[PDB]
Write a protein that binds this ligand. Structure first.
Ligand SMILES: [Mg+2]
Ligand SMILES: [Mg+2]
Ligand SMILES: [Mg+2]
Ligand SMILES: [Mg+2]
Ligand SMILES: [Mg+2]
Ligand SMILES: [Mg+2]
Ligand SMILES: [Mg+2]
Ligand SMILES: [Mg+2]
Ligand SMILES: [Mg+2]
Ligand SMILES: [Mg+2]
Ligand SMILES: [Mg+2]
Ligand SMILES: [Mg+2]
Ligand SMILES: [Mg+2]
Ligand SMILES: [Mg+2]
Ligand SMILES: [Mg+2]
Ligand SMILES: [Mg+2]
Ligand SMILES: [Mg+2]
Ligand SMILES: [Mg+2]
Ligand SMILES: [Mg+2]
Ligand SMILES: [Mg+2]
Ligand SMILES: [Mg+2]
Ligand SMILES: [Mg+2]
Ligand SMILES: [Mg+2]
Ligand SMILES: [Mg+2]
Ligand SMILES: [Mg+2]
Ligand SMILES: [Mg+2]
Ligand SMILES: [Mg+2]
Ligand SMILES: [Mg+2]
Ligand SMILES: [Mg+2]
Ligand SMILES: [Mg+2]
Ligand SMILES: [Mg+2]
Ligand SMILES: [Mg+2]
Ligand SMILES: [Mg+2]
Ligand SMILES: [Mg+2]
Ligand SMILES: [Mg+2]
Ligand SMILES: [Mg+2]
Ligand SMILES: [Mg+2]
Ligand SMILES: [Mg+2]
Ligand SMILES: [Mg+2]
Ligand SMILES: [Mg+2]
Ligand SMILES: [Mg+2]
Ligand SMILES: [Mg+2]
Ligand SMILES: [Mg+2]
Ligand SMILES: [Mg+2]
Ligand SMILES: [Mg+2]
Ligand SMILES: [Mg+2]
Ligand SMILES: [Mg+2]
Ligand SMILES: [Mg+2]
Ligand SMILES: [Mg+2]
Ligand SMILES: [Mg+2]
Ligand SMILES: [Mg+2]
Ligand SMILES: [Mg+2]
Ligand SMILES: [Mg+2]
Ligand SMILES: [Mg+2]
Ligand SMILES: [Mg+2]
Ligand SMILES: [Mg+2]
Ligand SMILES: [Mg+2]
Ligand SMILES: [Mg+2]
Ligand SMILES: [Mg+2]
Ligand SMILES: [Mg+2]
Ligand SMILES: [Mg+2]
Ligand SMILES: [Mg+2]
Ligand SMILES: [Mg+2]
Ligand SMILES: [Mg+2]
Ligand SMILES: [Mg+2]
Ligand SMILES: [Mg+2]
Ligand SMILES: [Mg+2]
Ligand SMILES: [Mg+2]
Ligand SMILES: [Mg+2]
Ligand SMILES: [Mg+2]
Ligand SMILES: [Mg+2]
Ligand SMILES: [Mg+2]
Ligand SMILES: [Mg+2]
Ligand SMILES: [Mg+2]
Ligand SMILES: [Mg+2]
Ligand SMILES: [Mg+2]
Ligand SMILES: [Mg+2]
Ligand SMILES: [Mg+2]
Ligand SMILES: [Mg+2]
Ligand SMILES: [Mg+2]
Ligand SMILES: [Mg+2]
Ligand SMILES: [Mg+2]
Ligand SMILES: [Mg+2]
Ligand SMILES: [Mg+2]
Ligand SMILES: [Mg+2]
Ligand SMILES: [Mg+2]
Ligand SMILES: [Mg+2]
Ligand SMILES: [Mg+2]
Ligand SMILES: [Mg+2]
Ligand SMILES: [Mg+2]
Ligand SMILES: [Mg+2]
Ligand SMILES: [Mg+2]
Ligand SMILES: [Mg+2]
Ligand SMILES: [Mg+2]
Ligand SMILES: [Mg+2]
Ligand SMILES: [Mg+2]
Ligand SMILES: [Mg+2]
Ligand SMILES: [Mg+2]
Ligand SMILES: [Mg+2]
Ligand SMILES: [Mg+2]
Ligand SMILES: [Mg+2]
Ligand SMILES: [Mg+2]
Ligand SMILES: [Mg+2]
Ligand SMILES: [Mg+2]
Ligand SMILES: [Mg+2]
Ligand SMILES: [Mg+2]
Ligand SMILES: [Mg+2]
Ligand SMILES: [Mg+2]
Ligand SMILES: [Mg+2]
Ligand SMILES: [Mg+2]
Ligand SMILES: [Mg+2]
Ligand SMILES: [Mg+2]
Ligand SMILES: [Mg+2]
Ligand SMILES: [Mg+2]
Ligand SMILES: [Mg+2]
Ligand SMILES: [Mg+2]
Ligand SMILES: [Mg+2]
Ligand SMILES: [Mg+2]
Ligand SMILES: [Mg+2]
Ligand SMILES: [Mg+2]
Ligand SMILES: [Mg+2]
Ligand SMILES: [Mg+2]
Ligand SMILES: [Mg+2]
Ligand SMILES: [Mg+2]
Ligand SMILES: [Mg+2]
Ligand SMILES: [Mg+2]
Ligand SMILES: [Mg+2]
Ligand SMILES: [Mg+2]
Ligand SMILES: [Mg+2]
Ligand SMILES: [Mg+2]
Ligand SMILES: [Mg+2]
Ligand SMILES: [Mg+2]
Ligand SMILES: [Mg+2]
Ligand SMILES: [Mg+2]
Ligand SMILES: [Mg+2]
Ligand SMILES: [Mg+2]
Ligand SMILES: [Mg+2]
Ligand SMILES: [Mg+2]
Ligand SMILES: [Mg+2]
Ligand SMILES: [Mg+2]
Ligand SMILES: [Mg+2]
Ligand SMILES: [Mg+2]
Ligand SMILES: [Mg+2]
Ligand SMILES: [Mg+2]
Ligand SMILES: [Mg+2]
Ligand SMILES: [Mg+2]
Ligand SMILES: [Mg+2]
Ligand SMILES: [Mg+2]
Ligand SMILES: [Mg+2]
Ligand SMILES: [Mg+2]
Ligand SMILES: [Mg+2]
Ligand SMILES: [Mg+2]
Ligand SMILES: [Mg+2]
Ligand SMILES: [Mg+2]
Ligand SMILES: [Mg+2]
Ligand SMILES: [Mg+2]
Ligand SMILES: [Mg+2]
Ligand SMILES: [Mg+2]
Ligand SMILES: [Mg+2]
Ligand SMILES: [Mg+2]
Ligand SMILES: [Mg+2]
Ligand SMILES: [Mg+2]
Ligand SMILES: [Mg+2]
Ligand SMILES: [Mg+2]
Ligand SMILES: [Mg+2]
Ligand SMILES: [Mg+2]
Ligand SMILES: [Mg+2]
Ligand SMILES: [Mg+2]
Ligand SMILES: [Mg+2]
Ligand SMILES: [Mg+2]
Ligand SMILES: [Mg+2]
Ligand SMILES: [Mg+2]
Ligand SMILES: [Mg+2]
Ligand SMILES: [Mg+2]
Ligand SMILES: [Mg+2]
Ligand SMILES: [Mg+2]
Ligand SMILES: [Mg+2]
Ligand SMILES: [Mg+2]
Ligand SMILES: [Mg+2]
Ligand SMILES: [Mg+2]
Ligand SMILES: [Mg+2]
Ligand SMILES: [Mg+2]
Ligand SMILES: [Mg+2]
Ligand SMILES: [Mg+2]
Ligand SMILES: [Mg+2]
Ligand SMILES: [Mg+2]
Ligand SMILES: [Mg+2]
Ligand SMILES: [Mg+2]
Ligand SMILES: [Mg+2]
Ligand SMILES: [Mg+2]
Ligand SMILES: [Mg+2]
Ligand SMILES: [Mg+2]
Ligand SMILES: [Mg+2]
Ligand SMILES: [Mg+2]
Ligand SMILES: [Mg+2]
Ligand SMILES: [Mg+2]
Ligand SMILES: [Mg+2]
Ligand SMILES: [Mg+2]
Ligand SMILES: [Mg+2]
Ligand SMILES: [Mg+2]
Ligand SMILES: [Mg+2]
Ligand SMILES: [Mg+2]
Ligand SMILES: [Mg+2]
Ligand SMILES: [Mg+2]
Ligand SMILES: [Mg+2]
Ligand SMILES: [Mg+2]
Ligand SMILES: [Mg+2]
Ligand SMILES: [Mg+2]
Ligand SMILES: [Mg+2]
Ligand SMILES: [Mg+2]
Ligand SMILES: [Mg+2]
Ligand SMILES: [Mg+2]
Ligand SMILES: [Mg+2]
Ligand SMILES: [Mg+2]
Ligand SMILES: [Mg+2]
Ligand SMILES: [Mg+2]
Ligand SMILES: [Mg+2]
Ligand SMILES: [Mg+2]
Ligand SMILES: [Mg+2]
Ligand SMILES: [Mg+2]
Ligand SMILES: [Mg+2]
Ligand SMILES: [Mg+2]
Ligand SMILES: [Mg+2]
Ligand SMILES: [Mg+2]
Ligand SMILES: [Mg+2]
Ligand SMILES: [Mg+2]
Ligand SMILES: [Mg+2]
Ligand SMILES: [Mg+2]
Ligand SMILES: [Mg+2]
Ligand SMILES: [Mg+2]
Ligand SMILES: [Mg+2]
Ligand SMILES: [Mg+2]
Ligand SMILES: [Mg+2]
Ligand SMILES: [Mg+2]
Ligand SMILES: [Mg+2]
Ligand SMILES: [Mg+2]
Ligand SMILES: [Mg+2]
Ligand SMILES: [Mg+2]
Ligand SMILES: [Mg+2]
Ligand SMILES: [Mg+2]
Ligand SMILES: [Mg+2]
Ligand SMILES: [Mg+2]
Ligand SMILES: [Mg+2]
Ligand SMILES: [Mg+2]
Ligand SMILES: [Mg+2]
Ligand SMILES: [Mg+2]
Ligand SMILES: [Mg+2]
Ligand SMILES: [Mg+2]
Ligand SMILES: [Mg+2]
Ligand SMILES: [Mg+2]
Ligand SMILES: [Mg+2]
Ligand SMILES: [Mg+2]
Ligand SMILES: [Mg+2]
Ligand SMILES: [Mg+2]
Ligand SMILES: [Mg+2]
Ligand SMILES: [Mg+2]
Ligand SMILES: [Mg+2]
Ligand SMILES: [Mg+2]
Ligand SMILES: [Mg+2]
Ligand SMILES: [Mg+2]
Ligand SMILES: [Mg+2]
Ligand SMILES: [Mg+2]
Ligand SMILES: [Mg+2]
Ligand SMILES: [Mg+2]
Ligand SMILES: [Mg+2]
Ligand SMILES: [Mg+2]
Ligand SMILES: [Mg+2]
Ligand SMILES: [Mg+2]
Ligand SMILES: [Mg+2]
Ligand SMILES: [Mg+2]
Ligand SMILES: [Mg+2]
Ligand SMILES: [Mg+2]
Ligand SMILES: [Mg+2]
Lengths: 202, 64, 149, 116
RNA sequence: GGGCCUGACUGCGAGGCCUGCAAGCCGAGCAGGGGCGAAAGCCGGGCCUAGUGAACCGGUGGUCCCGUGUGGAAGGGCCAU
RNA sequence: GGAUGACCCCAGGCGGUAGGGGAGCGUUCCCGAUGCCGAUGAAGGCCGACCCGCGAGGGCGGCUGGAGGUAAGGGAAGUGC
RNA sequence: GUGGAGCCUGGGAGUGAGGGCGCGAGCGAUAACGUCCGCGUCCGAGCGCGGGAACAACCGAGACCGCCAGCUAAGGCCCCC
RNA sequence: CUGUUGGGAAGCAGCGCCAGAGAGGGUGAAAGCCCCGUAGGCGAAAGGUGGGGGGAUAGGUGAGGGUACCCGAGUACCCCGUGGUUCGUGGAGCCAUGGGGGAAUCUGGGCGGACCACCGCCUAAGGCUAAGUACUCCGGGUGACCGAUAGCGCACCAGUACCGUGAGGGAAAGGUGAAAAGAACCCCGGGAGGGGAGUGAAAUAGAGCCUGAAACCGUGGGCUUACAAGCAGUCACGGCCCCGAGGGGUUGUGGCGUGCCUAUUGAAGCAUGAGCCGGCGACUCACGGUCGUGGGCGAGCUUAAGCCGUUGAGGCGGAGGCGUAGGGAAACCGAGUCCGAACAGGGCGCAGCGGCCGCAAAGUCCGCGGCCGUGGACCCGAAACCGGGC
RNA sequence: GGGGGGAACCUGGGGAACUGAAACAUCUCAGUACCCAGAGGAGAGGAAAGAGAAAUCGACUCCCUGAGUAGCGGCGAGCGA
């Protein structure tokens, strides 16, 4: 369906995989929205007039003082009093339909694949945990850092070598997600990663 | 908290397949000796509640 | 496609209605509540689904009917759920209650009863009950009804 | 998060207060008083925009009338004569003529008498 | 005024009046079994419009529908009052 | 009309309280941002007869101020006295 | 008769203190800026505009914005005007 | 590292370098490489812990047959009064027990919703028992949390000052500068204060210190006002001043002109509120419901708690829920069913668009918006009622 | 060995009223607020004289669900396994 370049010692070969041809910007939007929303801490809080510290005494008599009527000084009308309808601890998460998430993953990859920004790699030459090593291979693959790259592979050693780059996001293949894909300019995948990606969207 | 079903409504009424609301006729509980047989017969039937009064009771039965 | 390109469809995300914020909003002062009265108060009215101003309510004047039940409650008897022949079309070979459950046709904890809307198909269908027409269409179609217990 | 008033209100008030420059006492110094005065001034302008068109016409009619009676007839006669003559030169211009170009106005008075 | 009578029916009820609701009112026709009439037909109380009271709770006659492991029973439901 | 909110032409509507609907402006915060504006001066303040917008507002220029601010596009509210 | 007409399903209301005036009645005293109904109207919400000296509801007229242009309505044309 | 602007480099420019470390905070401004850190590692003599690893210890162990000795007492059980359970005296069982009566030891007894039979379940009247669970004074980590009227009542010597006999009530108050370099000396003055000198990039940064709005008070300048009638403006013209066929300020005369808000049939109203300015101040959130709406899948849709993974990575989990059939009080029947003697009549129910394909759809899930139920539910306000204390 | 103290948390012994039912007494609020005793780092519970219909399960505790179901109720407001 789509044609994907692949770096191998045999050279830049191609691969065929069926990612959707249709992109639904709203759907991808919905997934990102759900992602960024369920990670919220919801730790904003305030005190109601009952949680405020002051007493419950009526500060001066109801009538006949020539002043306005009042109750306790915790009333939200007073300065220092409680708040009205302020924030309390909150859970912003919700359960986005699994089929939507799955479809979103496929769509996000497809969009990159369609741009030609998607690259699959067989192995990572000389990289063994050193950043200078990843830069070697990266440069060799056409990745000079002029474009931000989401690197997805299970080889911890490759992730450790590339994590500190300003232009690189790193991910275990189990961790593939549409936010990170959309954030980046290029998607680079381990064949083992590209394999489990195929399994999740299948 | 989740809404509670009104038990007075559950015992007096039924929501039909299309969402009409059907209850027994009123008026043959007692004092029937001088009522015509045409009355007692017709009052043993079920009837459909007027749209407004029907729409209200349906909200009292959220889990039917 | 980048983050700046992510947008919801028109009408997907709508602005909320804020009342009580100025004349020009058309929702100022009274904040769409009108003037005075119980309804305009914080707390408002009684349940509009029932309360009728003090008179005997529409609902309460209607008579009750039927067995309402008594403590200790529901009486355990077997329950039957029907599924039509037309639903049985999707299958081939044998059908049993457990199969119809996975298909999402027969709910759990319910006994199976085959009903007659639709057409029969030469299958082995094992259930607790068949309607009169269910048996006829099934015996006619070369299907095998099996009576469970 | 919290969104306190902060900057917004001071700015709205200054808009008004600048619009109220020149007014008497607190009307140009107090926001609230400035606003009450500005409301009136908006309605007055709108009303006086509409009535300025009247104020001038009445002046024009007075002036045309003054020059007409010098030639032995009145305004109401002069206008009718002009209508019968089919002269459609307006009152703004008739008045200007009556003062700046008196012989031209004389000729118009002539055609006004001739028309009837 | 008189004769024979019990339709002062059971099962329904097209279609309308009125009408916020709930009620209230009128009702041709079909089936069951009757009454009167040679018959056509009439009769689902009274020339008509007042003589009334929703639900809840409970009494009585019937029905034999539910019956808390099962058979019953206690107690309910349904029809009538 | 052109084909689609591209702009133009012709026509008609446009007082408004309770109130329904629509389109926007601005305030705090998040993504955009390991970015961008910034001591050749951030925010905030004081001016303006200038520019854009029907308006809410947004620009630009001068003075003050001396270290922060933050786009297009989206998100969420302790959001306008 | 194509109208901010009408009918059907549904979402959201507000109102359930009205008032003057004209005509038709009751009540009152062929009284009330009286009261209670009816048909209409206006004010309510047109305390925007011209007239009535001034004056919500009487006469004229339904104010999208602009003009130092023109025609009229009621009412007016001796001076204030 | 160097150059350059600058009081100051981390700015800009030139040439480099590290990275399992480009989280973050400092440093005279904006620093991966100056500092503190960060990734990744290392660390306890002493005290505490030690649920994991190891070892002891206590403790634990047969089968037939006979015997009918034992198996928890004012107990079971029954009645009266009550509590507990969803159960409000109801057909009212079960569990508990204040009063009365009052057994038995496996052929004993309790229970399965009055009661009886049958069939089953269980072992009362003695005791102990981890973990999974609740909480946050304390320590740490993290925020689409606050930023000095906010956030705890308290950022500051606050449960303080102050008030109260007492229980108890309960504030206000943060900021010089990069560095005190915190202004030597001289002058007027009793001092306070100020003027010079000096410091600093800046002193209307001078300690009564960042910024420094408004009301409010004053000084100087321009225009104007002592024959004039006023919701204070507005429209026109003219005079004067200013900035250079225009504009700004001012106001002499002429025209017009009944504050704002609230409540009302109706207010400029001699009806409510407001001295003025600044800041605080009222339609929200959760769960459920009902419409609408943006998408996903569609006779199907969807998971919950949890489990795994991440450390702002997502996945698993099908228990369950909604829908796929209705009608009936129910037994029950079922595209029908209920009433009925009816095969009568009636109530309530049943039946996509194009070339196997595409499109659309029941339904359902998630988001979003309107409104509704439940809670304080738009905010403020009673008089009162109750508990425990003073 | 006890005594007294500890922010909440926990068991036990006692235990309101405003409020809601658009009045009120049953009912609700609610075995809540509060008082007292006690226990600890947790407390409680716990090894069937159970459940309840499965010819079945197998201590207790805690979450999801079953379910706003079964039912309870001046069969009202509501309460709720
Ligand atoms: Mg948060
Ligand atoms: Mg929050
Ligand atoms: Mg808080
Ligand atoms: Mg607070
Ligand atoms: Mg409050
Ligand atoms: Mg309070
Ligand atoms: Mg309090
Ligand atoms: Mg308090
Ligand atoms: Mg306190
Ligand atoms: Mg109190
Ligand atoms: Mg009190
Ligand atoms: Mg008190
Ligand atoms: Mg006073
Ligand atoms: Mg005062
Ligand atoms: Mg008071
Ligand atoms: Mg108060
Ligand atoms: Mg208080
Ligand atoms: Mg405070
Ligand atoms: Mg506070
Ligand atoms: Mg506070
Ligand atoms: Mg507040
Ligand atoms: Mg509140
Ligand atoms: Mg809230
Ligand atoms: Mg939470
Ligand atoms: Mg939500
Ligand atoms: Mg969730
Ligand atoms: Mg990185
Ligand atoms: Mg990183
Ligand atoms: Mg990036
Ligand atoms: Mg990242
Ligand atoms: Mg009856
Ligand atoms: Mg009865
Ligand atoms: Mg009769
Ligand atoms: Mg009869
Ligand atoms: Mg009878
Ligand atoms: Mg009958
Ligand atoms: Mg359900
Ligand atoms: Mg259902
Ligand atoms: Mg929103
Ligand atoms: Mg507004
Ligand atoms: Mg609106
Ligand atoms: Mg409005
Ligand atoms: Mg107001
Ligand atoms: Mg409204
Ligand atoms: Mg409303
Ligand atoms: Mg009001
Ligand atoms: Mg009212
Ligand atoms: Mg109202
Ligand atoms: Mg009222
Ligand atoms: Mg209403
Ligand atoms: Mg209140
Ligand atoms: Mg109320
Ligand atoms: Mg009454
Ligand atoms: Mg039932
Ligand atoms: Mg039970
Ligand atoms: Mg076969
Ligand atoms: Mg503020
Ligand atoms: Mg303002
Ligand atoms: Mg302000
Ligand atoms: Mg300002
Ligand atoms: Mg402004
Ligand atoms: Mg002036
Ligand atoms: Mg002027
Ligand atoms: Mg002044
Ligand atoms: Mg003055
Ligand atoms: Mg002033
Ligand atoms: Mg204005
Ligand atoms: Mg005008
Ligand atoms: Mg005018
Ligand atoms: Mg004219
Ligand atoms: Mg005119
Ligand atoms: Mg004039
Ligand atoms: Mg003459
Ligand atoms: Mg003419
Ligand atoms: Mg003319
Ligand atoms: Mg006779
Ligand atoms: Mg006779
Ligand atoms: Mg005979
Ligand atoms: Mg009818
Ligand atoms: Mg009717
Ligand atoms: Mg006959
Ligand atoms: Mg005969
Ligand atoms: Mg016959
Ligand atoms: Mg008949
Ligand atoms: Mg009669
Ligand atoms: Mg009657
Ligand atoms: Mg009754
Ligand atoms: Mg009752
Ligand atoms: Mg009864
Ligand atoms: Mg039976
Ligand atoms: Mg039985
Ligand atoms: Mg039994
Ligand atoms: Mg027997
Ligand atoms: Mg039997
Ligand atoms: Mg018997
Ligand atoms: Mg019986
Ligand atoms: Mg019976
Ligand atoms: Mg009856
Ligand atoms: Mg037009
Ligand atoms: Mg118009
Ligand atoms: Mg309009
Ligand atoms: Mg009103
Ligand atoms: Mg619209
Ligand atoms: Mg809107
Ligand atoms: Mg704003
Ligand atoms: Mg906005
Ligand atoms: Mg950032
Ligand atoms: Mg930044
Ligand atoms: Mg720069
Ligand atoms: Mg500088
Ligand atoms: Mg500068
Ligand atoms: Mg800011
Ligand atoms: Mg501006
Ligand atoms: Mg400066
Ligand atoms: Mg500035
Ligand atoms: Mg900084
Ligand atoms: Mg800003
Ligand atoms: Mg931003
Ligand atoms: Mg934007
Ligand atoms: Mg976004
Ligand atoms: Mg938020
Ligand atoms: Mg607020
Ligand atoms: Mg209309
Ligand atoms: Mg209309
Ligand atoms: Mg409607
Ligand atoms: Mg609405
Ligand atoms: Mg609304
Ligand atoms: Mg009203
Ligand atoms: Mg009302
Ligand atoms: Mg009323
Ligand atoms: Mg009325
Ligand atoms: Mg009245
Ligand atoms: Mg009246
Ligand atoms: Mg007349
Ligand atoms: Mg009259
Ligand atoms: Mg009369
Ligand atoms: Mg007289
Ligand atoms: Mg009157
Ligand atoms: Mg009169
Ligand atoms: Mg009269
Ligand atoms: Mg009228
Ligand atoms: Mg009104
Ligand atoms: Mg008028
Ligand atoms: Mg009108
Ligand atoms: Mg007039
Ligand atoms: Mg007038
Ligand atoms: Mg006049
Ligand atoms: Mg006037
Ligand atoms: Mg008038
Ligand atoms: Mg009058
Ligand atoms: Mg004319
Ligand atoms: Mg005329
Ligand atoms: Mg006159
Ligand atoms: Mg005349
Ligand atoms: Mg005069
Ligand atoms: Mg004249
Ligand atoms: Mg230098
Ligand atoms: Mg340097
Ligand atoms: Mg550089
Ligand atoms: Mg890091
Ligand atoms: Mg950093
Ligand atoms: Mg840093
Ligand atoms: Mg930088
Ligand atoms: Mg920065
Ligand atoms: Mg740094
Ligand atoms: Mg570490
Ligand atoms: Mg470390
Ligand atoms: Mg033995
Ligand atoms: Mg023995
Ligand atoms: Mg024993
Ligand atoms: Mg017993
Ligand atoms: Mg007892
Ligand atoms: Mg009880
Ligand atoms: Mg009991
Ligand atoms: Mg009962
Ligand atoms: Mg009981
Ligand atoms: Mg007992
Ligand atoms: Mg006892
Ligand atoms: Mg035994
Ligand atoms: Mg025994
Ligand atoms: Mg027992
Ligand atoms: Mg028993
Ligand atoms: Mg049992
Ligand atoms: Mg036995
Ligand atoms: Mg048992
Ligand atoms: Mg253990
Ligand atoms: Mg435990
Ligand atoms: Mg914990
Ligand atoms: Mg902490
Ligand atoms: Mg903030
Ligand atoms: Mg901050
Ligand atoms: Mg302060
Ligand atoms: Mg504070
Ligand atoms: Mg401050
Ligand atoms: Mg503290
Ligand atoms: Mg303080
Ligand atoms: Mg005292
Ligand atoms: Mg003292
Ligand atoms: Mg006190
Ligand atoms: Mg205070
Ligand atoms: Mg400083
Ligand atoms: Mg300092
Ligand atoms: Mg001296
Ligand atoms: Mg001296
Ligand atoms: Mg001395
Ligand atoms: Mg000195
Ligand atoms: Mg001095
Ligand atoms: Mg000095
Ligand atoms: Mg110097
Ligand atoms: Mg400088
Ligand atoms: Mg300065
Ligand atoms: Mg300074
Ligand atoms: Mg200062
Ligand atoms: Mg500073
Ligand atoms: Mg100052
Ligand atoms: Mg000032
Ligand atoms: Mg002066
Ligand atoms: Mg004089
Ligand atoms: Mg003079
Ligand atoms: Mg002038
Ligand atoms: Mg000028
Ligand atoms: Mg004037
Ligand atoms: Mg007036
Ligand atoms: Mg105003
Ligand atoms: Mg009032
Ligand atoms: Mg009044
Ligand atoms: Mg009045
Ligand atoms: Mg006045
Ligand atoms: Mg006043
Ligand atoms: Mg006055
Ligand atoms: Mg009043
Ligand atoms: Mg007011
Ligand atoms: Mg005062
Ligand atoms: Mg003032
Ligand atoms: Mg709302
Ligand atoms: Mg939805
Ligand atoms: Mg989906
Ligand atoms: Mg699924
Ligand atoms: Mg449900
Ligand atoms: Mg049913
Ligand atoms: Mg039957
Ligand atoms: Mg039928
Ligand atoms: Mg579809
Ligand atoms: Mg909704
Ligand atoms: Mg609603
Ligand atoms: Mg509440
Ligand atoms: Mg609230
Ligand atoms: Mg209160
Ligand atoms: Mg009491
Ligand atoms: Mg009392
Ligand atoms: Mg007391
Ligand atoms: Mg006491
Ligand atoms: Mg003790
Ligand atoms: Mg102790
Ligand atoms: Mg207790
Ligand atoms: Mg005790
Ligand atoms: Mg007591
Ligand atoms: Mg009570
Ligand atoms: Mg309450
Ligand atoms: Mg309550
Ligand atoms: Mg309630
Ligand atoms: Mg009450
Ligand atoms: Mg009440
Ligand atoms: Mg009372
Ligand atoms: Mg209770
Ligand atoms: Mg207790
Ligand atoms: Mg203790
Ligand atoms: Mg424990
Ligand atoms: Mg623990
Ligand atoms: Mg044992
Ligand atoms: Mg269920
Ligand atoms: Mg009931
Ligand atoms: Mg309770």
């Amino acid at each position: 369906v789509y044609q994907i370049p692949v770096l191998s010692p045999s050279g830049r070969r191609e691969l065929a995989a069926d990612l959707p041809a249709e992109i639904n910007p709203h759907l991808l939007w919905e997934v990102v929205r759900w992602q960024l929303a369920k990670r919220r801490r919801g730790t904003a809080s305030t005190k109601t007039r009952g949680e405020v510290a002051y007493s419950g005494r009526k500060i001066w008599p109801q009538k006949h003082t020539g002043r306005a009527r009042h109750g306790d000084i915790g009333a939200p009308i007073f300065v220092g009093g409680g708040v009205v309808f302020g924030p309390k601890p909150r859970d912003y998460s919700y359960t986005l339909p699994k089929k939507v998430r799955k479809k979103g993953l496929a769509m996000a990859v497809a969009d990159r694949a369609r741009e030609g920004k998607l690259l699959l790699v067989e192995a990572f030459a000389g990289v063994n945990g050193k950043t200078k090593e990843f830069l070697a291979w990266a440069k060799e693959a056409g990745l000079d850092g002029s474009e931000s790259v989401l690197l997805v592979t299970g080889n911890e050693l490759v992730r450790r070598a590339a994590r500190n780059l300003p232009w690189v996001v790193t991910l275990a293949p189990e961790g593939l997600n549409v936010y990170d894909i959309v954030r980046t300019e290029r998607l680079v995948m381990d064949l083992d990663a590209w394999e489990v990606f195929q399994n999740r969207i299948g | 908290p989740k809404m509670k079903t009104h038990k007075g409504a559950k015992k007096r009424v039924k929501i039909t397949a299309s969402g009409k609301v059907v209850a027994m006729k009123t008026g043959k509980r007692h004092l029937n000796w001088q009522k015509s047989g045409k009355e007692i017969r017709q009052k043993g039937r079920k009837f459909v509640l007027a749209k407004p009064e029907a729409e209200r009771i349906k909200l009292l039965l959220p889990y039917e | 496609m980048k983050l700046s390109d992510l947008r919801p469809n028109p009408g997907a995300n709508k602005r909320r209605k804020r009342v009580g914020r100025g004349p020009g909003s058309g929702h100022g002062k009274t904040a769409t509540r009108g003037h005075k009265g119980q309804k305009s108060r914080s707390g408002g009215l009684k349940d509009p689904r029932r309360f009728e101003g003090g008179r005997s309510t529409t609902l309460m004047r209607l008579p009750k009917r039927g067995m309402q039940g008594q403590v200790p409650g529901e009486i355990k008897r077997p329950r039957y759920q029907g599924v039509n022949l037309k639903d049985l079309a999707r299958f081939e070979g044998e059908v049993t209650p457990e199969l119809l459950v996975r298909a999402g046709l027969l709910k759990k904890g319910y006994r199976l009863k085959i009903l007659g809307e639709g057409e029969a198909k030469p299958l082995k269908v094992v259930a607790h009950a068949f309607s009169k027409s269910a048996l006829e269409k099934l015996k006619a179609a070369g299907g095998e009804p099996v009576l469970l217990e | 998060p919290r969104a306190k008033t902060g900057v917004v209100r001071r700015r709205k008030h200054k808009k008004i207060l600048k619009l109220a420059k020149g007014y008497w006492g607190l009307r140009s110094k107090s926001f609230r008083k400035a606003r009450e005065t500005l409301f009136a001034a908006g309605n007055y302008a709108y009303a006086h925009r509409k009535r300025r068109k009247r104020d001038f016409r009445r002046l024009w009619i007075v002036r045309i009338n003054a020059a007409c009676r010098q030639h032995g007839l009145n305004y109401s006669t002069f206008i009718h004569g002009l209508k019968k003559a089919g002269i459609e030169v307006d009152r703004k211009n008739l008045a200007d003529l009556a003062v700046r170009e008196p012989q031209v106005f004389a000729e118009l008075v002539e055609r006004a008498k001739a028309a009837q």
